[PDB]
Short mmCIF file of C-alpha atoms in Angstrom, two decimals:
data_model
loop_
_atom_site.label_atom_id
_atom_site.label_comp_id
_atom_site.label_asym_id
_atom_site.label_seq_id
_atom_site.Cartn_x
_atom_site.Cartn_y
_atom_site.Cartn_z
CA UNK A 24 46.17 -109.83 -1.61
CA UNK A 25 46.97 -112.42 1.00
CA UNK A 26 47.14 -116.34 0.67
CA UNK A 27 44.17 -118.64 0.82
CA UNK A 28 43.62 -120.60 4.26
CA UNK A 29 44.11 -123.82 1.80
CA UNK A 30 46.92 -124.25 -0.39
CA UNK A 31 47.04 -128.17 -1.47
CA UNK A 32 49.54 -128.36 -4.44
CA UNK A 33 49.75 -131.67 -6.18
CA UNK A 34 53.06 -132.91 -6.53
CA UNK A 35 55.36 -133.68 -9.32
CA UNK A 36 58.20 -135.95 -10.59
CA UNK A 37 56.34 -139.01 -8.53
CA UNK A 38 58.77 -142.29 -7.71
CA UNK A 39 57.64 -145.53 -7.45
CA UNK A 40 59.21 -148.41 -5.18
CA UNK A 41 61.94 -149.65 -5.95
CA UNK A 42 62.60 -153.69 -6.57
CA UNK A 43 66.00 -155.57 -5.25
CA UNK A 44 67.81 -158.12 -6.91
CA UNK A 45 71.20 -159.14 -7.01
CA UNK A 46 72.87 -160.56 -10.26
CA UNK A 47 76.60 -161.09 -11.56
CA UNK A 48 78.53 -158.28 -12.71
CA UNK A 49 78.65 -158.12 -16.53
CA UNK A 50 75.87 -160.24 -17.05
CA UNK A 51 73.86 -156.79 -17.63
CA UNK A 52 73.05 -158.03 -21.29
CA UNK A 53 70.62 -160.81 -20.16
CA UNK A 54 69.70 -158.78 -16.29
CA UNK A 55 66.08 -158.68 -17.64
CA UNK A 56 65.10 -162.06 -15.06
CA UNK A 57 67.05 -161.92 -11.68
CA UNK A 58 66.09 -163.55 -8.29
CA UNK A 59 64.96 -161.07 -5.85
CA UNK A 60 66.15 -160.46 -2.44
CA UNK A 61 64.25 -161.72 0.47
CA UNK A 62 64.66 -160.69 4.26
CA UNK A 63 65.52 -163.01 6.55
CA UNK A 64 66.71 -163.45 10.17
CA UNK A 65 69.99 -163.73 12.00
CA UNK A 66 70.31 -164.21 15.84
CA UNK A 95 68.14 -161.08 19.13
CA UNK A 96 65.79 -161.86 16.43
CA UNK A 97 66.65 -159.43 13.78
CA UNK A 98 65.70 -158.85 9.80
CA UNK A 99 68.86 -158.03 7.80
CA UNK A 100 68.88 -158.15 3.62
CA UNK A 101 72.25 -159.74 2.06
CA UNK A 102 72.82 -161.10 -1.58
CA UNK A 103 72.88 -164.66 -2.79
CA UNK A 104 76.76 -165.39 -2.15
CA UNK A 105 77.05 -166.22 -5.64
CA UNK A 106 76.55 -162.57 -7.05
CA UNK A 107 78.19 -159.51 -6.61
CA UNK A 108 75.67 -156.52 -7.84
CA UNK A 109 72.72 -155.28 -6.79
CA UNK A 110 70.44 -154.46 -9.31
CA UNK A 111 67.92 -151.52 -8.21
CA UNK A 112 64.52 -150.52 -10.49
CA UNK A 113 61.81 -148.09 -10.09
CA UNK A 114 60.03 -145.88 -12.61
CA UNK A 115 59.76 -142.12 -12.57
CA UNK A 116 56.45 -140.21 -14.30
CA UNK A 117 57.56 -136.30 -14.58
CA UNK A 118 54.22 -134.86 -14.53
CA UNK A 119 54.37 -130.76 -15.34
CA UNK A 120 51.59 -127.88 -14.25
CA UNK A 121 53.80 -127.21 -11.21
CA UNK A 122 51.71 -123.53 -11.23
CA UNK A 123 48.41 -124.80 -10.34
CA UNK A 124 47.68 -125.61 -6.79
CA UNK A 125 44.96 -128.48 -6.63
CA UNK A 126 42.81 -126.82 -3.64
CA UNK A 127 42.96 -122.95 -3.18
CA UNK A 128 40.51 -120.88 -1.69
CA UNK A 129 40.49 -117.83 -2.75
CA UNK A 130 40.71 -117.00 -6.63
CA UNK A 131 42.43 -113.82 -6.94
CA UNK A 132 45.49 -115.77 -5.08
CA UNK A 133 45.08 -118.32 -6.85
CA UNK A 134 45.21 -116.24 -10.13
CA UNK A 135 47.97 -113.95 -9.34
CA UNK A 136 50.29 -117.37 -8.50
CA UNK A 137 49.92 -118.48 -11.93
CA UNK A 138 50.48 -115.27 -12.90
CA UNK A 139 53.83 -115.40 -10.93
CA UNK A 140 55.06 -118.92 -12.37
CA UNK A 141 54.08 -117.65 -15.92
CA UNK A 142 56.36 -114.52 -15.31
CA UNK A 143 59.13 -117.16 -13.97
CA UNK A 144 58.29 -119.67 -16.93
CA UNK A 145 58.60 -116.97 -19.71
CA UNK A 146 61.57 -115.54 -18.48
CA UNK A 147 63.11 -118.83 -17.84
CA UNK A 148 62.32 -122.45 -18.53
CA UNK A 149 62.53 -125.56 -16.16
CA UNK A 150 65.93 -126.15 -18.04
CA UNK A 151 68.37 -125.11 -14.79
CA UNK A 152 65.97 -127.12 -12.66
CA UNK A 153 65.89 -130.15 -14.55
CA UNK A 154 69.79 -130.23 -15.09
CA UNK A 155 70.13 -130.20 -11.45
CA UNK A 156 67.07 -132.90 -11.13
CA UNK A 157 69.50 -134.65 -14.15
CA UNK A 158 71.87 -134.87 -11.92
CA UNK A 159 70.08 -137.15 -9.30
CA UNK A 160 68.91 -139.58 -11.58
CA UNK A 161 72.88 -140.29 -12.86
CA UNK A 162 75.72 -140.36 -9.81
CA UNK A 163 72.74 -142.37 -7.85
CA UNK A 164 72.17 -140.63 -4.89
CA UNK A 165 68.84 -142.90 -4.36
CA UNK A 166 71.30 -145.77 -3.67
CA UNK A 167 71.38 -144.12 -0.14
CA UNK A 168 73.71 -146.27 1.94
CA UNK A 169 74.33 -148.68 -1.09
CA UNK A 170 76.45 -146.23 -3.19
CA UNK A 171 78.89 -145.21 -0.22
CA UNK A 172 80.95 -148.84 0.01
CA UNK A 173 80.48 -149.06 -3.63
CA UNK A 174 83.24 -149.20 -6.41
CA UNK A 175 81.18 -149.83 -9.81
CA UNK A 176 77.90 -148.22 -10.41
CA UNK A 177 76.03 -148.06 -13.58
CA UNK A 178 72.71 -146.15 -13.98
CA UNK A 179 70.46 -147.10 -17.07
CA UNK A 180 67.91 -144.48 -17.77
CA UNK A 181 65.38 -145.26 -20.79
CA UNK A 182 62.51 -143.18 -21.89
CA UNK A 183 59.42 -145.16 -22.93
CA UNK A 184 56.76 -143.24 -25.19
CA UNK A 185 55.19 -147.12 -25.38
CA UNK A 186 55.96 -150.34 -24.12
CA UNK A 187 58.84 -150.14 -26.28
CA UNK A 188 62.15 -147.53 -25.17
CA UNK A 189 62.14 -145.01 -27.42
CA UNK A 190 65.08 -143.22 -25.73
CA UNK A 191 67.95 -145.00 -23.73
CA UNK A 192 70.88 -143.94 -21.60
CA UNK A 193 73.94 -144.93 -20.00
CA UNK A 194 75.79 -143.07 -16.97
CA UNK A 195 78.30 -143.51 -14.84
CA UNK A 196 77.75 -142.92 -10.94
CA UNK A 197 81.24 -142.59 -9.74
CA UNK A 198 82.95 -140.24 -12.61
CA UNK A 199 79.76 -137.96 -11.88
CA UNK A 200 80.41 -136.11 -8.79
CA UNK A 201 78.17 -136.74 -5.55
CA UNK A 202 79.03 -133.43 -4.35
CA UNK A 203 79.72 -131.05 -6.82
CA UNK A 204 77.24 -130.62 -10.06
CA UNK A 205 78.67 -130.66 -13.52
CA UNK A 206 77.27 -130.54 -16.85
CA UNK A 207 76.82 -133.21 -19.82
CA UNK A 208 75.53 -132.95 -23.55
CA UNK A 209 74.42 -136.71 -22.15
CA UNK A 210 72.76 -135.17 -19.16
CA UNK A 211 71.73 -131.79 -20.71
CA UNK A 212 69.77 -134.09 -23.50
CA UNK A 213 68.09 -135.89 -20.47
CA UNK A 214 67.56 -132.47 -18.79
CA UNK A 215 65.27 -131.30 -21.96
CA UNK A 216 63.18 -133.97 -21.32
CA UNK A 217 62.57 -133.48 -17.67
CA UNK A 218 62.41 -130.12 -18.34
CA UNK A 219 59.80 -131.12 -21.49
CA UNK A 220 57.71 -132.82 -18.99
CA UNK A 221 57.63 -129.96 -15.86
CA UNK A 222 56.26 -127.58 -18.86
CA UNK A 223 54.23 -129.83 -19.77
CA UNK A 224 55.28 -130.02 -23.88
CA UNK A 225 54.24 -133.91 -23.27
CA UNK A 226 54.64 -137.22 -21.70
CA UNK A 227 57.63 -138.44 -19.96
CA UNK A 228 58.02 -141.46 -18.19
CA UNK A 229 61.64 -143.09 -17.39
CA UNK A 230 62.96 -146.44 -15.94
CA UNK A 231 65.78 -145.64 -13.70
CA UNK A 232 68.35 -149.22 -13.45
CA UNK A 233 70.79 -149.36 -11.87
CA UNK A 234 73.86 -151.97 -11.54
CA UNK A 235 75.86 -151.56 -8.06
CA UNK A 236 79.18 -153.51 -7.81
CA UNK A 237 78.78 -153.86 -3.77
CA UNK A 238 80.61 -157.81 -3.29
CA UNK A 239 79.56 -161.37 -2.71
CA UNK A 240 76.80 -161.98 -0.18
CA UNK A 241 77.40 -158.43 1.04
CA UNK A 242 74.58 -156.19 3.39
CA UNK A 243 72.34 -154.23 1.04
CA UNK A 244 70.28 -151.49 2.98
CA UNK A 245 66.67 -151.84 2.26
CA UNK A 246 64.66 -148.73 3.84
CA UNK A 247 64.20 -149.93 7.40
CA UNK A 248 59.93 -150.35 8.57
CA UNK A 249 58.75 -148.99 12.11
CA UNK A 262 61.66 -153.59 12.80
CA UNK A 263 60.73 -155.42 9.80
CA UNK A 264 61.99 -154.26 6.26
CA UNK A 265 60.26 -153.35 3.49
CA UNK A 266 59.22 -155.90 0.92
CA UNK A 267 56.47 -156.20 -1.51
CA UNK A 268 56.64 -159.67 -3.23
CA UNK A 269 58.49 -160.86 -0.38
CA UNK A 270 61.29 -158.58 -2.04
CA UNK A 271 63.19 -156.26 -0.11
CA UNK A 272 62.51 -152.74 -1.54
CA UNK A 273 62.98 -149.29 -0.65
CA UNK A 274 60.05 -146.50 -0.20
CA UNK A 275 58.66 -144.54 -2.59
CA UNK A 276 59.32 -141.00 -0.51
CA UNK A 277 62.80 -141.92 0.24
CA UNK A 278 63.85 -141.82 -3.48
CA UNK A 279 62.21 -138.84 -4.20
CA UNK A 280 63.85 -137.31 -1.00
CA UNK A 281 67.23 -138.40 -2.98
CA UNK A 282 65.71 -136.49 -6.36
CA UNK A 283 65.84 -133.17 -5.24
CA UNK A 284 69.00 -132.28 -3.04
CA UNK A 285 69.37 -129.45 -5.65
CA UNK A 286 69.06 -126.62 -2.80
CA UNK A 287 72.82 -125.41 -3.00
CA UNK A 288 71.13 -121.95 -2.13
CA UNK A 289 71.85 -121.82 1.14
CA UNK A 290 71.60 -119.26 3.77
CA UNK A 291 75.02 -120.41 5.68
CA UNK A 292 77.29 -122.60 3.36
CA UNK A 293 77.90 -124.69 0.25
CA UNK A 294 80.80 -126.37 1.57
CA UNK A 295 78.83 -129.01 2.82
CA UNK A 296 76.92 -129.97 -0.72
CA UNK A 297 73.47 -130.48 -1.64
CA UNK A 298 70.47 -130.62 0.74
CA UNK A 299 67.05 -131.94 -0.09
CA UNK A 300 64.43 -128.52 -1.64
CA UNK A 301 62.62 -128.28 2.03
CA UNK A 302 60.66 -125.58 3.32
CA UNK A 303 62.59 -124.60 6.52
CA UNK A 304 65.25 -126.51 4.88
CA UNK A 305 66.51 -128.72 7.64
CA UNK A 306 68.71 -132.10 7.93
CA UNK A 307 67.99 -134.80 10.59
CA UNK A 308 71.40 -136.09 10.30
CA UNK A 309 73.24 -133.02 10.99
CA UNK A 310 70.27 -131.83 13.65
CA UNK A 311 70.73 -128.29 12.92
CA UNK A 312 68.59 -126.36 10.25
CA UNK A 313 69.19 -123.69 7.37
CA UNK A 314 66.79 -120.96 6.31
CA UNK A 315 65.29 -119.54 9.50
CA UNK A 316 61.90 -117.70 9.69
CA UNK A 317 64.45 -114.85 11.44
CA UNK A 318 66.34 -114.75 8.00
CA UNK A 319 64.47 -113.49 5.17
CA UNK A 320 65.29 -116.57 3.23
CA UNK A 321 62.73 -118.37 4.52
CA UNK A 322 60.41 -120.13 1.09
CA UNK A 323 56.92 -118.52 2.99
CA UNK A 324 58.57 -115.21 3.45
CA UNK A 325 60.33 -115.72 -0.18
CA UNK A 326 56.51 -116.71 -1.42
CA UNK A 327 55.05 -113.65 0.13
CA UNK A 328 57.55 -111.01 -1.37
CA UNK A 329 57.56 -113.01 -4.77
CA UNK A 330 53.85 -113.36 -5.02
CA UNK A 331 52.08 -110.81 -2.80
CA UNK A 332 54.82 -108.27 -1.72
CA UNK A 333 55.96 -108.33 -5.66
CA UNK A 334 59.40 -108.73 -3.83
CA UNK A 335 61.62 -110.52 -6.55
CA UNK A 336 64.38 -112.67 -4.85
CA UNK A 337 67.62 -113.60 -7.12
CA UNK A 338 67.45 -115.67 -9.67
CA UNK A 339 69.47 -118.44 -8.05
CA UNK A 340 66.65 -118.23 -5.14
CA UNK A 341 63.89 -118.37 -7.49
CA UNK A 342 65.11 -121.82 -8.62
CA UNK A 343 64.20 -122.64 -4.68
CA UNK A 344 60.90 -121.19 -4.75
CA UNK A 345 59.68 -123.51 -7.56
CA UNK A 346 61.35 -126.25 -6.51
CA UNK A 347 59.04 -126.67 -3.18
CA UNK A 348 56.07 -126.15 -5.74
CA UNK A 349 57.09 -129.76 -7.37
CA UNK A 350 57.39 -131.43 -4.01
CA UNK A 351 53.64 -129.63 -2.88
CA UNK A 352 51.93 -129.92 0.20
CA UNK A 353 49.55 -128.15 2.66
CA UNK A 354 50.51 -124.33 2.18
CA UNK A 355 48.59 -121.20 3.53
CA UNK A 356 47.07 -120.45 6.66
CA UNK B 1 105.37 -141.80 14.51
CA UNK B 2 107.39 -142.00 11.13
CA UNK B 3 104.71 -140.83 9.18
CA UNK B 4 101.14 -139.47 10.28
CA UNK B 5 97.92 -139.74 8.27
CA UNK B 6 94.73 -138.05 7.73
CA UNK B 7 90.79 -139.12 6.50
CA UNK B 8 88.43 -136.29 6.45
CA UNK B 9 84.69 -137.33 6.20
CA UNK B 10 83.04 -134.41 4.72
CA UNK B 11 79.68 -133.02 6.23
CA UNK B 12 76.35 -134.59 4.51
CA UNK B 13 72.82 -136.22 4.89
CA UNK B 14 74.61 -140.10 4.49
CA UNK B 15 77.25 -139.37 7.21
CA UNK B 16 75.04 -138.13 9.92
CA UNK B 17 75.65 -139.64 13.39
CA UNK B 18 72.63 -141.55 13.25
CA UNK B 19 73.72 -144.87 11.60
CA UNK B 20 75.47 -144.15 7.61
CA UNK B 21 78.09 -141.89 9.53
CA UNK B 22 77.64 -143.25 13.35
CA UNK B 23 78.70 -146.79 12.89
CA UNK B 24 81.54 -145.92 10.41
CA UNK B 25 84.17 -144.80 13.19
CA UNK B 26 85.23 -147.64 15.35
CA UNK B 27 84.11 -151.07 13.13
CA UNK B 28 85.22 -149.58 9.56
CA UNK B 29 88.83 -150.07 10.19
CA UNK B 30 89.32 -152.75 7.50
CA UNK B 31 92.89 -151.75 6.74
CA UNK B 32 93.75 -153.04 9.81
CA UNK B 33 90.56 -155.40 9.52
CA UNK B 34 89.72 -156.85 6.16
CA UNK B 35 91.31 -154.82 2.97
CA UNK B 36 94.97 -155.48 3.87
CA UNK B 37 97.23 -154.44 6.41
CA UNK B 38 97.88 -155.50 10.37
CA UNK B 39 101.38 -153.61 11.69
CA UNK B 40 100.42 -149.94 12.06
CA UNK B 41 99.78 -147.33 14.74
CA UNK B 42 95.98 -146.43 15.67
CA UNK B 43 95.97 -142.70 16.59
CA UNK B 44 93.12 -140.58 16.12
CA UNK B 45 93.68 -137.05 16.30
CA UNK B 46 90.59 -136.13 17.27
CA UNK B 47 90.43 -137.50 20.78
CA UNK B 48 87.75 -135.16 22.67
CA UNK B 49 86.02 -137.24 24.99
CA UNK B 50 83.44 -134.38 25.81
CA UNK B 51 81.15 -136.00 22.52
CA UNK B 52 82.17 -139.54 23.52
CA UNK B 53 83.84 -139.61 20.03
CA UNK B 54 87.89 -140.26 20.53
CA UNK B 55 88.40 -138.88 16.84
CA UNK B 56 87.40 -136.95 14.51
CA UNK B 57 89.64 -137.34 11.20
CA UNK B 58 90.81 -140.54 9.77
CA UNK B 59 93.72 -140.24 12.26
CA UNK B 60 96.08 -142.62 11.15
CA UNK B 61 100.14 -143.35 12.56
CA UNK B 62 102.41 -145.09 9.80
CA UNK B 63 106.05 -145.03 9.12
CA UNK B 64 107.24 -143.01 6.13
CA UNK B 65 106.53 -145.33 3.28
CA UNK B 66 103.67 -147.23 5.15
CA UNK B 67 102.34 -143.14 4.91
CA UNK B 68 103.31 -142.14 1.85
CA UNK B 69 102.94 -145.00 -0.64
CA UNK B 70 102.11 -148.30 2.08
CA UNK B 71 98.70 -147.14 3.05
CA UNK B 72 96.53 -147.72 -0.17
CA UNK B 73 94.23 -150.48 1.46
CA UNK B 74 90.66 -150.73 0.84
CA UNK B 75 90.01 -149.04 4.42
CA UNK B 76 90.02 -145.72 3.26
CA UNK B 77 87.35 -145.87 0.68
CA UNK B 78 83.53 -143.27 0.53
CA UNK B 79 85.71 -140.21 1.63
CA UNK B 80 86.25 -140.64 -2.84
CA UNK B 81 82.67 -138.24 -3.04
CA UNK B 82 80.52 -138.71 0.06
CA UNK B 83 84.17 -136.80 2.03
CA UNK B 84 87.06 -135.49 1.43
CA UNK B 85 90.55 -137.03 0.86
CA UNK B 86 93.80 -137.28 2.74
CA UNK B 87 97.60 -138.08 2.38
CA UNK B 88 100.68 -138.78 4.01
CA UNK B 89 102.95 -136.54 5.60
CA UNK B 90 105.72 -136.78 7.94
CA UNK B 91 106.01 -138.40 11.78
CA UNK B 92 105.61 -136.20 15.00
CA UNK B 93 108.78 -134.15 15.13
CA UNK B 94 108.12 -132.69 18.44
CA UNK B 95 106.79 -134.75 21.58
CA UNK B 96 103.35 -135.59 21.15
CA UNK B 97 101.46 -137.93 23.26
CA UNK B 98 98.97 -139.17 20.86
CA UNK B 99 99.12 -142.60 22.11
CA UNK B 100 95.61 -143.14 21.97
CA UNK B 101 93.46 -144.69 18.55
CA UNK B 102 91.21 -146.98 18.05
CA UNK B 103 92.14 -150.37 19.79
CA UNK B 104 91.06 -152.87 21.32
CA UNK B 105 88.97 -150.84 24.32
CA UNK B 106 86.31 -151.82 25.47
CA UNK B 107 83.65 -153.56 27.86
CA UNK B 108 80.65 -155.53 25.96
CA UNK B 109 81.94 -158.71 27.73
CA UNK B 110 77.97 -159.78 27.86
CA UNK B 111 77.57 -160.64 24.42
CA UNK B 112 78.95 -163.97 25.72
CA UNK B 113 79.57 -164.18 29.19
CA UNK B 114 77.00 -167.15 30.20
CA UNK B 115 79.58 -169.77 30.06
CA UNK B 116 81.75 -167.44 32.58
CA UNK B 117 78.38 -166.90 34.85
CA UNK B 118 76.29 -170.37 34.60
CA UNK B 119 77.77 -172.33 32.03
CA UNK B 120 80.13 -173.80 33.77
CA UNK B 121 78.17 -177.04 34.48
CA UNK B 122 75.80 -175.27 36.80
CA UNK B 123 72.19 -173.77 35.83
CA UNK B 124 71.23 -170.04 34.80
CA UNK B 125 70.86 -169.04 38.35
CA UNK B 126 74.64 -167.77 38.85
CA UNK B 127 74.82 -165.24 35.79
CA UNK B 128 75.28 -162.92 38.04
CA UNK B 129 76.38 -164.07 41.44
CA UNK B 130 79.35 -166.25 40.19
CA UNK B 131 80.65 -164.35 36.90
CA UNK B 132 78.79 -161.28 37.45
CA UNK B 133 77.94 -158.94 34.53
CA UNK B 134 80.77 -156.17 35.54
CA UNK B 135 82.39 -156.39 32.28
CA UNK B 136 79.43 -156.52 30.03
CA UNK B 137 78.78 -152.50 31.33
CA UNK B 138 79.01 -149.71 28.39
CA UNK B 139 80.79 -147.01 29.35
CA UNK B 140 81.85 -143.73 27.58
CA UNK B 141 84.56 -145.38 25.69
CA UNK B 142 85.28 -142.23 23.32
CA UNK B 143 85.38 -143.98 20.11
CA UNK B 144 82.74 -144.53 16.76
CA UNK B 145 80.03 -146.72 16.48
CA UNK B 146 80.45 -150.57 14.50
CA UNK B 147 78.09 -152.21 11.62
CA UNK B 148 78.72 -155.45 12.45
CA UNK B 149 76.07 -158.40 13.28
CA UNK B 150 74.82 -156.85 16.51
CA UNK B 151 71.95 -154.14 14.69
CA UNK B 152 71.10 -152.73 11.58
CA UNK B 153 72.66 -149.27 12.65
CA UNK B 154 76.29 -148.35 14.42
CA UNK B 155 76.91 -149.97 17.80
CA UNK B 156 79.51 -149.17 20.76
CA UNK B 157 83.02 -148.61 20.78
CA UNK B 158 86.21 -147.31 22.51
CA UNK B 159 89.75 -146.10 22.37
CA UNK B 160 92.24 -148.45 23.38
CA UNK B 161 95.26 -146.13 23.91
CA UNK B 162 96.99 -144.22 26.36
CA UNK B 163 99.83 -142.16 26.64
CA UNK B 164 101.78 -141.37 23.47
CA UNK B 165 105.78 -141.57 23.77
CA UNK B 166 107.89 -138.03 22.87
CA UNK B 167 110.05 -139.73 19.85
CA UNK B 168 109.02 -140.63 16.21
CA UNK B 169 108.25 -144.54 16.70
CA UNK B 170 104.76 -147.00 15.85
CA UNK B 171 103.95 -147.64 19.52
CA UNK B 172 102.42 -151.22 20.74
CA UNK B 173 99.79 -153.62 18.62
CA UNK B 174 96.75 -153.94 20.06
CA UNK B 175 93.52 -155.25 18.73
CA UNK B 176 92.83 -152.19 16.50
CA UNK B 177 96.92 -151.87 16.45
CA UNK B 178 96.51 -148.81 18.88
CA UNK B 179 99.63 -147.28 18.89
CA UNK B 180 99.95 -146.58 22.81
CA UNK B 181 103.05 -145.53 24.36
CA UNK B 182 104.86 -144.57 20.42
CA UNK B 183 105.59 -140.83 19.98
CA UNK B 184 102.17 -140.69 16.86
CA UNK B 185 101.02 -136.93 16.32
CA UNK B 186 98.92 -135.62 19.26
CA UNK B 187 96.15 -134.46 17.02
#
């Protein structure tokens, strides 16, 4: 009847951190063992991240577990709520799978929109996606980042093979787990940007590396359903979907577009939305979070 | 001038004004910089100095092959899918006074100003009194931020241009190659 006072939803499709290291350009068959990148100082003291002279391409790695039950929240206090929400995702799930989702989340993983300020200055990148049932790959890929569009979203029998699988995992048909590399063309000795620590920068092994959150920010600009415009491209699946960059918002709570008020008429109201704003709804459900009063 | 140019950077997260689309408007000029090319006119045809930004497209004042075939440097390159693309055209054909680019503007004379202050065989004690620090004062020079080695984001800038001639004519070189006092396209 109304919505619990705690709504904790466990997220899905969970990064990791992702390792630099830099590495000549076609050497990719032996780019198993590179040196790292390390962060040193210039001055006025400052910490900036720059290649070994030598090479040419940055080589970035993380891994990617797609983890599926995106109905259940993980705390909910009241069970009729809780109930009638799975019964909404199972009416969403039947009539449609996680296929349109995950061809948009395909998307992300390809033209390598987690190279943030690494890909814009760029003129080679190639992503290697493999899926690993074991140790072993039992699954590989290869994908360009350039000849797949940054703003505009087409589809691949490529990416529409990969999309299955993400959209195997979100249903939760099995296990999926993916190691995202990719090879960056960016020049000799030239400034990588490492995500930038409150001004330090962040390394693990003494390797410069970039935070887990701020990939998975990059893995979901799939919200093209805007209230205002699509001439501007993707934005990141946000509730009160709102930039910092461009300052402004979308989605207002004075708009009925707004994901509580869409949750409200889709769950309680029984106030469908379209289709192309139900991909939204679900889409905030794999990112989770605190929901409810 | 003889032929007028174009760059539009297309709205997004990466080309915010904070510092992936800040410090990309006054430093990133490597066709007149790094990727090849030195003899053109800077005019930006976006000069509104109510933002302290003095453009807002790739404003850019060539002759007619320098616009239509001559301007393939590497200085032009992201607007490929983070923006949108431009192209050449032709030069002003009425008068327009857009005599103002990016050039070589500006007041950050601090960044090494010590030997005009106290290094002139005297102590530290005159870095002010003798040289003072007058020209090492930011201003609102209308112009893009730089990602040069002064911080991890954008920096300062300005325009160095003035008034634009009424002709079709590549103005005076400057630092940037500002093409003041040449007859470029007024916006």
């Amino acid at each position: 009847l109304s919505t619990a006072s705690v709504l904790a939803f466990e997220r899905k499709l969970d990064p990791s951190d992702a390792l630099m290291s830099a590495g000549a350009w076609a050497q990719r068959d032996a780019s198993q063992e590179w040196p790292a990148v390390t962060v040193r100082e210039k001055s006025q003291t400052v910490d900036v991240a720059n290649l070994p002279s030598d090479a040419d391409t940055l080589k970035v790695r993380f891994t990617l577990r797609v983890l599926g039950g995106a109905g259940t929240p993980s705390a909910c206090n009241d069970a009729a709520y809780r109930d009638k929400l799975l019964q909404t995702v199972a009416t969403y799930v039947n009539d449609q799978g996680f296929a349109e989702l995950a061809r948009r989340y395909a998307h992300n993983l390809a033209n390598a929109r987690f190279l943030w300020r690494n890909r814009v200055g760029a003129e080679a990148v190639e992503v290697r996606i493999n899926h690993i049932r074991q140790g072993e790959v039992a699954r590989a890929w290869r994908f360009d980042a350039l000849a797949i569009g940054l703003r505009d979203f087409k589809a691949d029998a490529e990416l529409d093979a990969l999309a299955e699988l993400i959209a195997s995992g979100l249903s939760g048909s099995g296990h999926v787990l993916l190691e995202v590399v990719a090879f960056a063309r960016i020049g000799d000795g030239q400034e990588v940007f490492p995500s930038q620590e409150l001004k330090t920068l962040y390394s693990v092994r003494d390797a410069a590396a970039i935070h887990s959150q701020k990939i998975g920010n990059a893995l979901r600009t799939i919200d093209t359903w805007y209230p205002d415009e699509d001439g501007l491209g993707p934005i990141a699946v946000e509730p009160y979907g709102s930039v910092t960059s461009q300052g402004k918002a979308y989605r207002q709570p004075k708009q009925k577009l707004d994901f509580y008020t869409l949750l409200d008429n889709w769950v309680l109201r029984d106030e469908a939305p379209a289709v192309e704003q139900q991909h939204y709804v679900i889409a905030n459900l794999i990112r989770g979070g605190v929901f409810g009063e | 001038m003889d032929h007028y140019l174009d760059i539009r950077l297309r709205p997004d997260p990466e080309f915010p004004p904070a510092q992936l689309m800040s410090v990309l408007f006054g430093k990133l000029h490597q066709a007149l910089v790094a990727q090849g090319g030195d003899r053109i006119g800077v005019s930006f045809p976006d000069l509104d100095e109510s933002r302290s930004r003095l453009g807002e497209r790739l404003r850019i004042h060539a002759s007619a092959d320098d616009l239509r075939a001559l301007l393939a440097r590497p200085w032009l390159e992201g607007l490929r899918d983070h923006l949108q693309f431009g192209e050449p055209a032709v030069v002003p054909h009425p008068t327009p006074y857009r005599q103002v680019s990016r050039v070589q503007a500006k007041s950050n004379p601090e960044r090494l100003r010590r030997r005009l202050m106290r290094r002139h065989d005297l102590s530290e004690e005159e870095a002010r009194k003798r040289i003072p620090d007058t020209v090492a004062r930011a201003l609102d020079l209308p112009f893009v931020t730089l990602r040069s080695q002064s911080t991890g984001q954008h920096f300062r800038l300005f325009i160095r241009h003035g008034p634009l001639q009424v002709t079709a004519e590549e103005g005076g070189f400057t630092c940037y190659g500002l093409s003041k006092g040449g007859f470029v396209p007024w916006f």
